[PDB]
Amino acid sequence: MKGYIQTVTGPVKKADMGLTLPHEHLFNDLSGVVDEPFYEFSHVLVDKKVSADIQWGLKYDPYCCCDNMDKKPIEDVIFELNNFKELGGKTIVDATGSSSIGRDIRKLKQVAELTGINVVASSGLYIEKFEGKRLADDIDAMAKMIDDELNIGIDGTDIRAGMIGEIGVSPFFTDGEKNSLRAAALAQNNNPYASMNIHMPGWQRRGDEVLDILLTEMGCDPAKISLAHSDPSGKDIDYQCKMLDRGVWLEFDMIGLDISFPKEGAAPSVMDTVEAVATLIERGYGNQIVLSHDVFLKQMWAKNGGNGWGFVPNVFLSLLAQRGIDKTIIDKLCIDNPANLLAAENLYFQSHHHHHHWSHPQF
Template sequence: MDTVITVTGEQSANDLGVTLPHEHLIIDASIWVPDGPELTAIQRRKLEESVSMENLWWLAAYGRQPKWNSLDNRRLDDVETAKREAMRFVAEGGETLVDVTPMSPGLGRDPGALKRIANHTGLNVVAGTGHYVRHAHPPRIDDQSASEIADEMVGDIVDGIDGTGVRAGVIGEIGATNGFSDHPNEKTVFRAAAIAQQRTGAPITIHPPVHYKEGHDVLDVLEEAGANLTNVILGHLDGAMELDNASAYYDSLAERGVSLEFDTFGRIGYIASEDVCFPLDETRIRELRRLFDKGYGDQLLVSHDICKKNQLTKYAGHGYDYILRDIVPRLRRREFSETEITSLLVDNPARALTIEE
C-alpha cells in the first residue's frame, strides 16, 4: 500500500483526497521581520502593533515589505483560530493539509497542536521536519555533520517529534536563501535531507530562494548527496514567474523529475525592498495551462503558503479554502478538464507525499 504519514498515523495515499501540500497552521514566522537600527521610529511602532481592523489596511498595502511589518501578523499561534480556518477548507471539500513548519527553533512547530486540529476537523494533517533558512538555524548546525542532522530528521519521522509520538511525514520545508551556493550550512542541511530521504523514503519539500532562479543549485546538492528527485517538491516557484525566461526555467526543472509547486496563490503585489513582484493568479493559471500542454501536468502542485494572520479569513485574508472557492471555478472557465483539476488537487499530491518503499 502507498502510505503517507499523518499526525494521527499512517494513511493510504489513495485516501488523501483534495490536498494542500504547502501550508502552515501553527508557525512563528517573525524571523523575516528585521529589528535593528535601520528601522525608523514609525516602523518600530508598527512592528509592535497587534493585528486589528485599524491596521489591516497597511498590512495589506505594505505588509510584504520586511521593514513595514508586524511581529503579531507573522505569528499563527492560536489553535482555536486554526481549527475554524481549517474547517472552511473542509467545508469546500478539502481533506488533507501539509503543515511544512520545520524543526528550526523559534518557528513554533507544535505537533500536539497539529494533532488536535486534525482530530477536531477530520483533516489529514502532515507535519514537517528538518531546518529552514540559515538565519533560522540553531547554533549547533555550525558543528554538525550532514549525517548527524539527518539523524534528527529520521527520528522525527520514525519515532515522533519531541517525544510526542506524532510523526513527521515530509522532510521540510528545507530552506535556501539567495546565493545558496555560498552558504555552507544550508548546503549541509540539504545533504542531510537527502540522507534522511534515503533512510526513510519520506519526500523532501524545498523553500528555494523565492524570487530567484536558483532551483537547479539546490537540486544539484540534493542529487549529489543521493536524493531521488522524483520524490522532491520544489516550492514557491510562482515567486520567479515575473522573471525573464521563467517558463524555460520551469521546463528545465520539470525535466529533472521534481514536482513543481506553485504555492502562493492569493499572494500578489510588488515588494519594493527586493524589486520583485508576485504574479496575478491569472498569470499562475496561464502558466499551469502551458505546463499541462507541455506534458508536465502530473508534476504540478498548488497551494497558498498561509503563514500570516492577514492571510486568514478572520483578518480579511483569502483563507485555506481560496483555491477551492475561487481558483477551481476559474480553472474550469479556462477549460481545464476535470481530470486535470483532479491531478492538481488529488492525484499529484498523493503521489508526491507517498513514502517510498
C-alpha cells in the same frame, strides 16, 4: 506500493487523502525576526492586532507587525480550517519543519483530533538566518535528527512527521544550507515514503544547483522532491521546464498570497499563476505540479480579509477551468497530484534501515 502518509494521528493511505494542501503553516512563530517599519506609513502597523482594517498596510509591510508574526491561536486555526473542510478538504501539510520557525507538534495533533482533517507535520531545518549554527552540525547528525522525527517522534512526543522540509535554501545558499540539503537527502534515502519539500529563493533561479546536489550528487528520487515557491518564476518558462525535465515537482504554493515584500520581491498575482500553470499543463507537465497557499501570516486568514485555505480549490481551480484547462486535469491537481508527491513510494530506496547508514558494516 502501498503508499501512505504519516499524519500526526497515524498513517493514512494514499487513496484516502482526498483534497490535499501540500504546503501550509498551521502553527508558526516568526517573533524573533520582526522587522522595523520600512515605510513612513508602517509605524502604525507595528503594535496593532491583525484585522481586515489594516490589510491596506500589511500587504506592503507584513513583517513589521508583531501580531502578524506571532504564534497562531488554535481557535483561529480551527476556524480557518473549517473553510477548507467545508469544501471537502481532507488533508493539510504543515511545512513548519523546525523549532526555529515555531513548529508546534502538540497543537497540530489537537487540530487533527478536533477537526478530523489529516494533518501532516514536517521535519527539516530552515534557512541559516533562523537556524544559525544548527546548520554547521555533522551531516549524519542532521540526517539522524530528521530520521528520528519521521520514525519515532518530535520534541519528546510520539507524534511523527510525514514530510521532510521545508528545507531552507536562502538567496545566499550558504555552506550550512548546502549541508542541511545533503542531510535531508540522506534522511529521505532511508525513508521510502517521505517527500522532500525545498524552500527555494523564489525570485532567484537556483534550481539547477539545488538539483545538482539532490539528484546528481545524493542520488535522490526526483519524483519525491518538490521545489517550493516556484510561483515567482512562473514567467520563466525555460527555467521551469528545465526543472520539470529533471523529474521533480514544481510547487506553486503562493496562490492568493497577494503581498508585496519590501525586499525579496512582490508576489505574482493569481492571474499570473493561472497563466503559468495553464501553460505548463498545455506543455504536458500537469502530472508534475502541486498547488498551495503557504498561509504563514495572520493577514492571510480569510477572517482578516486574506484568502484563507479555501482559495486554491474553490477559486484557482475555477480560474483554470475558465482558462480552458480540461476538467480531468483540474480534478487531479489538488487530489491525485499531492497524493502522489506526498505518499507514493520512492523508486530508488524501498527499505527503511534502523540506521540511515544501515548499508555500512557495524563490525
